[PDB]
Amino acid sequence: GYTTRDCPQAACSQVVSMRDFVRDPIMELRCKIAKMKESQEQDKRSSQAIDVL
Amino acid sequence: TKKLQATIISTKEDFLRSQEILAQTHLPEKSVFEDIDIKRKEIINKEG
């Protein structure tokens, strides 16, 4: 409904369209590594707790 | 590994249930061997 809209995030003042956006691998890599680290830490803590008992 | 972690959690729960069952002593009678000897004497006397 709007041809151009201001960027919601701060530190910038510009209006961009849908076509301007391009895929960013950095964000997906950060999300994947965060998921892997949280999964591994949960597995290790559960294993250590069971080994203690 | 996740499956074995789940299984060992279940085994820990089973161990806790086993400890709860062990809370009931169910001690064997202190004189089972003595009663066996008494009945052996009784049967020997009865046959005599």
Amino acid at A7: C
User: For residues A21 and A18, what is the distance between their CA atoms, to the nearest angstrom?
Assistant: 6
Alpha helices in chain B (DSSP H): 2-23, 32-47
Q: Does B12 touch chain A (CB under 8 A)?
A: yes
What are B3's two structure tokens? 């499956």
Long-range contacts (CB closer than 8 Å, 24 or more residues apart) made by B24-31 = none
User: For residues A5 and A16, what is the distance between their CA atoms, to the nearest angstrom?
Assistant: 6
Question: Is the CB of B5 less than 8 angstroms away from the CB of A43?
Answer: yes
Method used to solve the structure: cryo-EM
Helix (H, G, I), strand (E, B) or coil at A16: strand
User: For residues A23 and A44, what is the distance between their CA atoms, to the nearest angstrom?
Assistant: 34
User: For residues B29 and A5, what is the distance between their CA atoms, to the nearest angstrom?
Assistant: 87
Q: Does A39 touch chain B (CB under 8 A)?
A: no
- What does this entry list as its resolution, in Å? 8.5
User: For residues B48 and B46, what is the distance between their CA atoms, to the nearest angstrom?
Assistant: 5
Q: Judge whether B15 and A50 are in contact, CB under 8 Å.
A: no
Question: In sequence order, what are the residues at sequence separation of 6 or more whose Cβ sits closer than 8 angstroms to the Cβ of residue B12?
Answer: A50, A53
